[PDB]
Amino acid sequence: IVPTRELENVFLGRCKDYEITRYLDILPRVRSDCSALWKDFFKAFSFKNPCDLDLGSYKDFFTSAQQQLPKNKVMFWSGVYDEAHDYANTGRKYITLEDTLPGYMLNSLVWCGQRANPGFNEKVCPDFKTCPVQARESFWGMASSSYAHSAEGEVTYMVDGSNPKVPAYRPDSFFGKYELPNLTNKVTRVKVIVLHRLGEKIIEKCGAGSLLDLEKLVKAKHFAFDCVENPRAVLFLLCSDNPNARECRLAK
Amino acid sequence: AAIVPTRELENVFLGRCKDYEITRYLDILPRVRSDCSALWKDFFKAFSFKNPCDLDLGSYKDFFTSAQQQLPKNKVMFWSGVYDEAHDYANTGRKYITLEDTLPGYMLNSLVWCGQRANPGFNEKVCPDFKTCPVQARESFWGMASSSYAHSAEGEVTYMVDGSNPKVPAYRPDSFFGKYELPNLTNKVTRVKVIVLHRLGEKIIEKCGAGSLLDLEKLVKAKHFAFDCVENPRAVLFLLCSDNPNARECRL
Ligand SMILES: *[C@H]1O[C@H](COP(=O)(O)OP(=O)(O)OC[C@H]2O[C@@H](n3cnc4c(N)ncnc43)[C@H](O)[C@@H]2O)[C@@H](O)[C@@H]1F
Numbered sequence: 021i022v023p024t025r026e027l028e029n030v031f032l033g034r035c036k037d038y039e040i041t042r043y044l045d046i047l048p049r050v051r052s053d054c055s056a057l058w059k060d061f062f063k064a065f066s067f068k069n070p071c072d073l074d075l076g077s078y079k080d081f082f083t084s085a086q087q088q089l090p091k092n093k094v095m096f097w098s099g100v101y102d103e104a105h106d107y108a109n110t111g112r113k114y115i116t117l118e119d120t121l122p123g124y125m126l127n128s129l130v131w132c133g134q135r136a137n138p139g140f141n142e143k144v145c146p147d148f149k150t151c152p153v154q155a156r157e158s159f160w161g162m163a164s165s166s167y168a169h170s171a172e173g174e175v176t177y178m179v180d181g182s183n184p185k186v187p188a189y190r191p192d193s194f195f196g197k198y199e200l201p202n203l204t205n206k207v208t209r210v211k212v213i214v215l216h217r218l219g220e221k222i223i224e225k226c227g228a229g230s231l232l233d234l235e236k237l238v239k240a241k242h243f244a245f246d247c248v249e250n251p252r253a254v255l256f257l258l259c260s261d262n263p264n265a266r267e268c269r270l271a272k
Numbered sequence: 273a274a275i276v277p278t279r280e281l282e283n284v285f286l287g288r289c290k291d292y293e294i295t296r297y298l299d300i301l302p303r304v305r306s307d308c309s310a311l312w313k314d315f316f317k318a319f320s321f322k323n324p325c326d327l328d329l330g331s332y333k334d335f336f337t338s339a340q341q342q343l344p345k346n347k348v349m350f351w352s353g354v355y356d357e358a359h360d361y362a363n364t365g366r367k368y369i370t371l372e373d374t375l376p377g378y379m380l381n382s383l384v385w386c387g388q389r390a391n392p393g394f395n396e397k398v399c400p401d402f403k404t405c406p407v408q409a410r411e412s413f414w415g416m417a418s419s420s421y422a423h424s425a426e427g428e429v430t431y432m433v434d435g436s437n438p439k440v441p442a443y444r445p446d447s448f449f450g451k452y453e454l455p456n457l458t459n460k461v462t463r464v465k466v467i468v469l470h471r472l473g474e475k476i477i478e479k480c481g482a483g484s485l486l487d488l489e490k491l492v493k494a495k496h497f498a499f500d501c502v503e504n505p506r507a508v509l510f511l512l513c514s515d516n517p518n519a520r521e522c523r524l
């Protein structure tokens with residue numbers, strides 16, 4: 021894997037663009053200037069072995085970086101990145117991690133430290149399917165946790181119902197591992213949306229398999245629960261990308 | 273009461289430019305030759321150290337020569353009156369390209385700025401209302417951006433219009449499309465494909481083959497382009513129906 025070029029300039033550039041122009045109406049600005057955020061983030065993994073990371077390294081970064089999240093608007097997802105983002109719609113309907121300050125600064129970036137100067141590898145980074153679990157998930161694991169700890173009201177969870185190999189809810193997803201257990205009592209409802217991909221065999225349904233697992237786990241935590249499969253707004257989003265699919269038929 | 277310039281103009285501009293250069297639309301649009309600081313210099317000199325209304329259609333020419341990307345065949349889209357729907361359908365460059373996906377569109381999208389005579393050469397407190405400035409100055413930037421963008425289109429071009437406005441024809445010689453785009457389309461364009469938007473639950477005002485759209489047709493054919501026109505095609509209708517699943521038009 022090839023690390024992002026000019027990590028620092030990209031970071032600070034996204035940081036300044038975000039501060040001045042992004043989500044102004046939707047998300048609050050953070051207290052720290054961009055260079056203090058840079059110091060906290062860099063300190064986390066710099067001058068270290070690329071797999072000397074744990075779930076605590078970026079904690080000061082996230083403490084600096086965390087925003088209060090608008091009530092009822094937080095959305096979580098597993099295995100349906102693209103439709104959750106389209107449905108969320110850049111903050112118009114829901115908020116995702118990539119809408120928040122740290123999610124937006126680091127989306128799609130690739131970095132790693134080294135013990136030698138200049139503290140980080142600008143040439144080659146380890147295929148993270150090589151370090152332990154805790155160092156692999158040290159950045160986005162803490163991010164997911166910091167995000168989830170900030171959620172309030174109803175939160176929404178979008179899942180893949182058409183995967184014959186991967187259960188809609190898994191205790192060992194970032195959601196199961198880091199997000200769900202970090203919901204505080206400010207959260208009152210987990211609303212699930214199951215995606216039944218077009219042209220595909222339906223695999224999971226509300227009330228059965230791993231979604232019943234989830235339902236019990238949510239109810240055990242003193243949250244309300246509900247669940248729907250291809251609700252109309254969602255279905256229509258998928259139909260625009262495949263408008264002749266059988267599921268997309270309109271009136272004559 | 274007063275119009276507010278963007279804060280930290282130069283930092284926002286460089287931040288966006290850098291972010292874009294290194295991480296944006298990599299698989300979709302090519303990079304430009306000039307670095308960010310050169311682009312800032314050509315942009316700054318267009319308006320700085322002059323009165324705020326002392327600008328013309330040629331002012332940003334050097335900036336546009338430097339920032340213009342070559343644009344992908346058959347993917348260029350134009351719109352009047354339906355900003356949101358056009359950008360939704362275009363899908364951040366995955367289905368069509370818009371001016372906002374290009375480098376200069378991205379950098380200056382939503383920003384507000386103006387020159388002054390006194391140091392430091394641009395006004396940080398206040399900008400005039402555009403209706404106070406002569407048209408060549410009021411349109412200097414976005415007028416140049418649209419002609420330059422239109423001039424780079426190759427293959428089929430798509431044009432999305434509002435067919436539901438009772439006071440604003442779908443096509444108008446007086447719109448940005450009509451002033452700066454249609455007439456700067458070169459002989460590398462093969463076809464104009466019009467997509468007429470009929471807003472859900474509203475009176476249908478314009479139709480393919482009559483009214484200002486019949487003017488658009490003959491105009492297009494006398495530039496020797498092919499022409500076609502479709503009204504609420506499914507792929508668009510499904511996007512409208514996603515935000516309003518209850519309309520008559522979305523019936524199952
Ligand atoms: C926090 O967690 C979920 C998403 O994680 P899950 O493990 O539940 O979902 P899954 O689809 O199984 O895993 C895909 C992983 O990619 C990570 N990721 C986030 N952002 C990026 C970027 N920008 N580039 C590469 N990978 C990224 C995810 O966190 C997943 O682990 C969401 O609801 C919360 F964001």
Ligand SMILES: *[C@H]1O[C@H](COP(=O)(O)OP(=O)(O)OC[C@H]2O[C@@H](n3cnc4c(N)ncnc43)[C@H](O)[C@@H]2O)[C@@H](O)[C@@H]1F
Binds near residue numbers: 349354355418448449
């Ligand atoms: C070149 O120009 C047209 C778009 O402009 P038109 O005059 O043809 O159409 P209209 O919708 O009447 O006005 C668009 C111009 O104003 C800016 N603009 C409008 N709405 C927004 C929003 N919501 N965000 C940012 N900018 C907006 C644009 O800069 C246009 O110049 C397109 O085919 C090509 F862009």
